[PDB]
Amino acid sequence: GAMGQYEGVFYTDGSAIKSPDPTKSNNAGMGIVHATYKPEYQVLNQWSIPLGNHTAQMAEIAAVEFACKKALKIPGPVLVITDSFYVAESANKELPYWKSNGFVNNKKKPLKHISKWKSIAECLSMKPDITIQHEKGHQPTNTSIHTEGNALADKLATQGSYVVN
């Protein structure tokens, strides 16, 4: 109804693991889940992107950029949901809002991670059809359709950590 009809939905997740050896290093991975609005809710496919020299914060923002390009790539509009509101609202408003200030957040401090936002700006610049949403945590209500994607994305993110050590 109000949601409308989109080609599908993209759920991204980010996780990181700390070890005693890599004191100044952590293992993080990204998990993306694709869903559809057909008459039967089902994941079209799963995506895992293990990071080597990245951090949990970078895995969360990188997860939104990943589906971001894959979302617009589709010949139709897609919805992208993330477990971080900052990153989500980032490509949702900061992306276009920062461009107005020349990729700058406030005059007091410059925009951070501009390179990461620059890549997402190239996709969102092609068309706002890319919708961004922020997960409400894990199992926020007795029943939730978005929560299901969070479970599949959580497993993909954990598998990314096993890909690197």
Side-chain angles (χ1 to χ4, degrees), residues 7 10 34 47 65-78 80 122-124 126-127 129-130:
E7 295 299 340
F10 279 56
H34 310 295
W47 220 277
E65 171 184 5
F66 198 76
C68 178
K69 295 184 185 240
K70 291 195 178 294
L72 182 109
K73 182 184 188 224
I74 311 191
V78 185
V80 173
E122 187 185 1
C123 186
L124 186 50
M126 290 185 186
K127 238 122 124 231
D129 288 349
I130 288 174

Side-chain angles (χ1 to χ4, degrees), residues 4-165:
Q5 294 178 343
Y6 308 99
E7 295 299 340
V9 177
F10 279 56
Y11 308 93
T12 82
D13 186 6
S15 69
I17 304 178
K18 297 183 185 124
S19 266
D21 257 284
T23 307
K24 297 186 184 301
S25 296
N26 303 335
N27 304 325
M30 298 194 309
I32 308 310
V33 185
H34 310 295
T36 190
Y37 284 110
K38 245 191 294 148
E40 296 305 337
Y41 187 83
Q42 185 183 55
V43 57
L44 288 84
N45 262 347
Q46 300 174 346
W47 220 277
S48 185
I49 300 120
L51 311 182
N53 299 324
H54 292 82
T55 186
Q57 190 182 61
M58 290 172 73
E60 293 185 351
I61 192 158
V64 180
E65 171 184 5
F66 198 76
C68 178
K69 295 184 185 240
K70 291 195 178 294
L72 182 109
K73 182 184 188 224
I74 311 191
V78 185
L79 321 188
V80 173
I81 311 186
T82 90
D83 65 359
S84 271
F85 185 86
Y86 187 81
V87 66
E89 188 70 23
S90 194
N92 189 65
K93 185 176 68 111
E94 301 299 345
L95 243 289
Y97 182 85
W98 282 332
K99 186 181 186 190
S100 305
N101 298 343
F103 310 150
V104 185
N105 200 21
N106 300 322
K107 296 184 185 295
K108 295 184 184 60
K109 278 188 171 240
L111 186 57
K112 296 184 186 178
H113 304 87
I114 299 175
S115 305
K116 295 185 185 54
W117 300 118
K118 185 183 187 325
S119 303
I120 300 177
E122 187 185 1
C123 186
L124 186 50
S125 287
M126 290 185 186
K127 238 122 124 231
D129 288 349
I130 288 174
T131 307
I132 301 178
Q133 301 185 339
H134 175 230
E135 301 179 351
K136 299 183 185 276
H138 180 65
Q139 200 163 349
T141 72
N142 292 347
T143 303
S144 179
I145 298 173
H146 303 297
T147 291
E148 188 181 0
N150 190 2
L152 301 183
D154 292 346
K155 294 185 183 221
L156 299 183
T158 307
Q159 295 176 346
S161 68
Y162 291 98
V163 183
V164 183
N165 300 319

